[PDB]
Amino acid sequence: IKELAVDEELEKEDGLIPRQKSKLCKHGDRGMCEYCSPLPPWDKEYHEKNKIKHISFHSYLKKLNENANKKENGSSYISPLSEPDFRINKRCHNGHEPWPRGICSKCQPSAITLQQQEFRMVDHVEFQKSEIINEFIQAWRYTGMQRFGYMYGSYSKYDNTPLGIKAVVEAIYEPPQHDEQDGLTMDVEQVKNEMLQIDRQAQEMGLSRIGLIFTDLSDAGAGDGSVFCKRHKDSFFLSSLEVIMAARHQTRHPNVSKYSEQGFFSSKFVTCVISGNLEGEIDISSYQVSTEAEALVTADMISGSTFPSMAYINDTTDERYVPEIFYMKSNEYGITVKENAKPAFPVDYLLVTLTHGFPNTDTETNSKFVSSTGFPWSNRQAMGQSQDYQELKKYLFNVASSGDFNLLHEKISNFHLLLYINSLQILSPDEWKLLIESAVKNEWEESLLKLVSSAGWQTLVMILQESG
Amino acid sequence: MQIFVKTLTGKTITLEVESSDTIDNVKSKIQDKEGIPPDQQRLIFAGKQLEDGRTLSDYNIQKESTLHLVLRLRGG
Amino acid sequence: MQIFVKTLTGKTITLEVESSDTIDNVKSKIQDKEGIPPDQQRLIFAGKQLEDGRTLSDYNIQKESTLHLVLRLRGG
Ligand SMILES: [Zn+2]
Ligand SMILES: [Zn+2]
């Protein structure tokens, strides 16, 4: 099987950390005893020294390869990187062949200790431009209600975190949803039918749906104060209703891995939320879900509770056997061992954090999508920017009826403009594929003149001039 | 008599409105079924925004026509 | 022969025309089933506005070829 091009590059590099000679070393200069030996990239002591709170899963893959492959014979190639299962094997390899009549300890799911995950799949989410997500908050500034979107992007290496993958996003697509002041809830059938055609155009453009965003602002008084502070240390970090939508999105998009026995493991999916800081701004934060316990129990046992920090655990009806969930908390006198014989266990423990950021404006490798970021989006029907062909006379117009190719190609690289053109499918699919590849790639000057000489682009500007 | 109000998520809401009442009573009837205040509500009739102070006869809205519902706060 | 008459709203309707017929027979066919007068029947092929008093041999209209129709919409 074949993995991603980014995932195979992190596997080949060892990522060792070099050290220097010290006063504690008693050996010679041409050697190393223990104090200047090469440090492994999975040691968590070096991680918390530089305030890195997770061990960068590609290095966690290396720390399990040392346990799988040894100096001894072995002759196995097991590679035990699989999803730990809480479901019940029906055959059970014993005399209690039905679960209605019989269950023993080798098939019973053990009591969940609630230990936090030490490794994250995505180590650092990054963005492309501050003007891209400024249009997303501007949707709230016009209708006053919450929004929703899906992030399309790619992946590359990250040199800050040892053996880490960074998440790059390029554009944000919004599905048609019904907004509300308190929260939001849309139909999953019309979104999945709409997201199927966007994945078609994302393949030729080199994009993949790897993220989503949802807003939560609660403006205070619209004067000096920006927003309220809903999510803090004493309150919930992520609501339990949005854990369900984050869990189903990770199971729909698996990550291919040759080390896993099933063929897919350790999904690379980000969930970002606009919530605001403690003091005064609308700074965002992102956390992703845990694979070890939460990713498998969401198929059978997650039920909604009235508290945003916790989630209710329901009962067993003849196939849905669940084990007891335990966690430690302080009582009125001291700190005690596991107490939970009670439902509504918290879900903030099962989240691992990420580091969001925006790159510097002075230099970058590329940006690939900065045309205007002011074009009316596809499914923004709550706002007034959902126009017909009247907008195409205002937006591009083949500027001033005779456009220069340095000023014409800079507008054609928009994500939602190219996704609006092919829906009319005036051009051929072969000429459309070279149209979107010219706008997204470099050395575009020889191929842009091929587009203007084609009869399909001439019919597009002729059918636009007669219409309003 | 019959009317059809449809949101952006592809969900049509059935409602029985009088042929000679105001648009504000239509916004009050959709308030009771869901719990949305009618101040931020707006009704689009084939690209034309219905004014709440008028009636159903001057806009020539016929029986069981497809309507649109959108929410937009004035200050927000 | 088979052609693809497509208007500005993406609605494609199959019509019939001879390879040596004038375009006014197509304009009369739109006037029959759509009821559009010829002052708003604007066909465009190869980036040029097709005049109503020409034939298909000048624009080289072949079999199974699409057509781009523009309909005028105004309030005045
Ligand atoms: Zn040493
Ligand atoms: Zn068993």
What is the C-alpha separation between A362 and C41, in angstroms, rounded?
A: 53
What is the C-alpha separation between A234 and A102, in angstroms, rounded?
A: 44
- CA A43 to chain CA centroid, nearest Å: 26
List residues in chain B touching A: CB distance below 8 A.
7-11, 36, 40, 70-73, 75-76
Q: What method did the depositors use to determine the structure?
A: cryo-EM
**Which candidate from A389, A463, A468 shows the least CB-CB separation from C68?**
A463
What is the C-alpha separation between A81 and A68, in angstroms, rounded?
A: 10
**HSE-CB for A429 with a 13 A CA cutoff:** 3
List residues in chain C touching A: CB distance below 8 A.
8, 10, 42, 44-49, 68, 70, 73
Identity of the residue numbered A40 = P
What is the C-alpha separation between A61 and A13, in angstroms, rounded?
A: 12
Between the CA of A18 and the centroid of ligand 1 the distance, in Å, is 12
Q: Which residues contact A357 (CB under 8 A, 6 or more apart)?
A: A124, A125, A126, A127
SS3 letters for chain C? CEEEEECCCCCEEEEECCCCCECHHHHHHHHHHCCCCCCCCEEEECCEECCCCCEHHHHCCCCCCEEEEECCCCCC
What is the C-alpha separation between A80 and A74, in angstroms, rounded?
A: 14
State whether residue A191 is helix, strand or coil: helix
A459–chain C Cβ distance below 8 A for any pair: yes
- Pairing of β C2-6 and β C12-16: antiparallel
**HSE-CB for A369 with a 13 A CA cutoff:** 25
Helix (H) or strand (E) holding B69: strand B66-71
Strand partners, C44: C49, C68
**Chain C contacts of A466, Cβ < 8 Å?**
42, 44, 49, 70
Q: Which of A247, A251, A80, A61 is nearest to A165 (CA)?
A: A61
Identity of the residue numbered A202 = A
What is the C-alpha separation between A419 and B47, in angstroms, rounded?
A: 23
What is the C-alpha separation between B26 and A179, in angstroms, rounded?
A: 19
CA–CA–CA angle A33, A35, A36 (5° rounding): 80
Q: What is the DSSP string of A59-95?
A: HHHHHHHHHHS-SS----------PPP-S--SSTTSS
Q: What is the DSSP string of A140-168?
A: HHHH-S--EEEEEEEEEEESSSTTEEEEE
Cross-chain residue pair A178–B76, CB shorter than 8 Å: no
What is the C-alpha separation between A127 and A154, in angstroms, rounded?
A: 11
**Lateral strand order in the sheet of B66-71:** B12-16, B2-6, B66-71, B41-45, B48-49
Identity of the residue numbered A171 = A
* CA–CA min distance A467, chain C (Å): 7
* CA–CA min distance B51, chain A (Å): 17
A455–chain C Cβ distance below 8 A for any pair: yes
With 0-12 / 13-18 / 19 or more C-beta atoms within 10 angstroms meaning exposed / middle / buried, residue A161 is buried
Between the CA of A319 and the centroid of ligand 2 the distance, in Å, is 14
Per-residue b or e along A412-432, where b marks 16 or more CB atoms closer than 10 Å to that residue's CB:
bbbbbbbbbbbeeebbeeeeb
For CA atoms A335, A340, A343, A344, give the dihedral sign: positive
What is the C-alpha separation between A190 and A213, in angstroms, rounded?
A: 18
What is the C-alpha separation between B37 and B22, in angstroms, rounded?
A: 17
State whether residue A422 is helix, strand or coil: helix
CA–CA–CA angle B27, B30, B32 (5° rounding): 115
* CA–CA min distance A305, chain B (Å): 21
Q: Which of A216, A214, A207, A131 is nearest to A169 (CA)?
A: A207
Query: Token pair for residue A182?
Result: 């308190």
Strand partners, A252: none
**Chain C contacts of A455, Cβ < 8 Å?**
46-47
**Chain A contacts of C10, Cβ < 8 Å?**
424
- Pairing of β A285-289 and β A351-353: antiparallel
Alpha helices, DSSP H only, in A338-412? 390-395, 405-408
Q: Mark residue A74 as left, alpha or beta (left: phi above 0; alpha: psi -120 to 50; beta: remaining).
A: left
Interface with C, mutate which of A392, A423, A463, A464 (most C CBs under 10 A): A463
Between the CA of A88 and the centroid of ligand 2 the distance, in Å, is 8
Query: Token pair for residue A104?
Result: 């023993």
Query: Token pair for residue A74?
Result: 């072995």
What is the C-alpha separation between A152 and A440, in angstroms, rounded?
A: 14
Query: Token pair for residue A171?
Result: 């554009």
Q: What is the DSSP string of A321-343?
A: ----B----B-SSSB-S----SS
Cross-chain residue pair A467–C8, CB shorter than 8 Å: yes
**Lateral strand order in the sheet of C42-45:** C12-16, C2-6, C66-70, C42-45, C48-49
What is the C-alpha separation between A458 and A454, in angstroms, rounded?
A: 7
Contact in structure between C2 and C64 (CB atoms under 8 Å): yes
What distances in angstroms separate CA A421 from CA A256, A388, A438, C67, one per listed residue? 33, 11, 15, 18
A222–chain B Cβ distance below 8 A for any pair: yes
Q: Which residues contact A224 (CB under 8 A, 6 or more apart)?
A: none
Domain boundaries defined on chain C: 1-76
* CA–CA min distance B5, chain A (Å): 13
**Which candidate from A144, A186, A190 shows the least CB-CB separation from B76?**
A144
Helix (H) or strand (E) holding A288: strand A285-289
Resolution (A): 3.9
Strands (E), A179-246: 208-215
A445-453 vs A429-440: helix axis angle to the nearest 10?
150
Locate tokens 């009316």: which residue? A376
For CA atoms A23, A26, A32, A33, give the dihedral sign: negative
Query: Token pair for residue A376?
Result: 């009316």
